From a paper:
Proteins attached to the surface of group A and group B streptococcal human pathogens that contain tandemly arrayed Rib domains have been associated with invasive infections and proposed as potential vaccine candidates. Here, we study Rib domains from Rib, R28, and from a [name] from [name]. Together, these 5 structures of homologous Rib domains, and further sequence analyses, show Rib is an example of domain atrophy, a rare event in domain structural evolution involving the loss of core secondary structure elements, and also reveal the remarkable structural malleability of this domain family. The structure, molecular dynamics simulations, and small angle X-ray scattering of a Rib domain pair suggest tandemly arrayed domains are likely to form an elongated rod on the bacterial cell surface, thus suggesting a possible mechanism of immune evasion mediated through domain number variation.
Thus, we solved the structure of “Rib Long” (RibL) (residues 1165 to 1268) and “Rib Standard” (RibS) (residues 1269 to 1329) at resolutions of 1.07 Å and 1.25 Å, respectively. RibS belongs to the “Rib” subfamily, giving a Cα rmsd value of 0.6 Å for superposition with both RibR and RibR28N, versus a Cα rmsd of 2.3 Å for RibL. As predicted, the Ig-fold D/E strands missing from RibR and R28N are also missing from RibS but are present in the RibL structure. Thus, RibL comprises a full Ig-like fold which likely represents the ancestral state of the Rib domain, and RibS is an example of evolutionarily recent domain atrophy from RibL; this is remarkable because there are very few cases where we have the structure of both atrophied and nonatrophied domains that are closely related in sequence. In the atrophy of the Ig-like RibL, a significant loss of the structure (∼20% compared to RibR/RibS) is involved, but the domains remain thermostable with melting temperatures (Tms) of 78 °C and 88 °C for RibL and RibS, respectively, and 71 °C for RibR.
Numbering used by the authors: 1269 to 1347
Write the structure that this text describes.
Amino acid sequence: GQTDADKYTPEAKDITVTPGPTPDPAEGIGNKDTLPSGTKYEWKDPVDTTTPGDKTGTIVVSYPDGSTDEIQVTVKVTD
């Protein structure tokens, strides 16, 4: 009786951006090719990338069955 979250292991990928609005969360998973098609990506909470610095955020990976993983990443906002 397994869920998708029992089977798949998303990998964090740190990203770098210029100051700007919250980036595309798909950029924070480094092994999307390993995950089922129909897997969705969203930030748990929007990362504030409006100012420079190293931000911490979490990507919610939602599998086709509705189970989830939560993956923390660093977003390096440049000066």
